[PDB]
């Protein structure tokens, strides 16, 4: 959507991994069946014992779900942001 030349970097798939990790640390994403914090020590012992599928499948194929819906995104993201126009479909 930009005029061309008369004679916005697509970041590499490897450098994006740090951003992907940051978006999981800050609790925007979550695993498909994340039980979360266990209630008692006995269940926590079993949870620390068992290895889930998400601990073995590749980094780029781990399913995530979202904690913030795009409506809240458009409500919160300032209109002056350059990707605000993409907050909707």
């Amino acid at each position: 959507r930009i005029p061309t030349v008369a004679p916005i970097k697509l970041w590499l798939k490897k450098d994006v991994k740090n951003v992907w990790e940051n978006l999981v640390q800050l609790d925007f994403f979550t695993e498909k069946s994340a039980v979360g914090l266990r209630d008692n020590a006995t269940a926590a012992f079993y949870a620390s014992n068992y290895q889930f599928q998400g601990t073995m499948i590749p980094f780029d194929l781990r399913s995530y779900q979202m904690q913030i819906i795009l409506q809240e995104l458009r409500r919160i993201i300032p209109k002056s942001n350059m990707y605000y126009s993409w907050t909707q479909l």
Binding site: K14, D15, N18, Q51, M56, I57, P58, D60, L61
Partner: protein, 132 residues
């Protein structure tokens, strides 16, 4: 400029494999992403982003035989290369304790992404891109 254009956080012909190993990997990737429905349709003379599915050993061997360039058959070298692939973490299994390959309940899946198998096929001159 060249220092800033690259993150250089990377720890650094990407995978040295025999021809048998390369063709085994090519067949395994087809198995892990192509429906069992289309095997007879495509290989008998009679999806890029989802997680891979499981496959049986016979499907892998049959597709390998169908795509290997008169029959190649299955010798000790083929199975040895297949086991090397597993040892190299190129093919995953459905088990985590007391590994026993001959147990009839273990299935296989591919751990190698598209960007590597593309270059492997390019080095093999095999046109996977026309099978999907």
């Amino acid at each position: 400029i060249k220092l800033f254009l690259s993150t250089d956080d990377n720890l650094s012909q990407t995978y040295d494999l025999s021809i048998i190993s390369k063709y085994l990997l090519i067949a395994s990737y087809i198995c892990s992403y192509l429906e069992p429905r289309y095997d007879a349709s495509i290989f008998s003379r009679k999806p890029r982003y989802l997680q891979p599915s499981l496959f049986a050993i016979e499907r892998l061997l049959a597709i390998f035989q169908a795509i290997f360039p008169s029959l190649m058959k299955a010798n000790i070298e083929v199975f040895q290369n297949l086991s090397e692939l597993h040892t190299l973490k190129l093919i995953a299994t459905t088990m985590n304790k007391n590994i026993d390959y001959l147990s009839p309940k273990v299935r296989w899946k591919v751990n190698v992404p598209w960007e590597i198998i593309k270059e492997i096929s390019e080095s093999v001159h095999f046109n996977i891109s026309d099978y999907f």
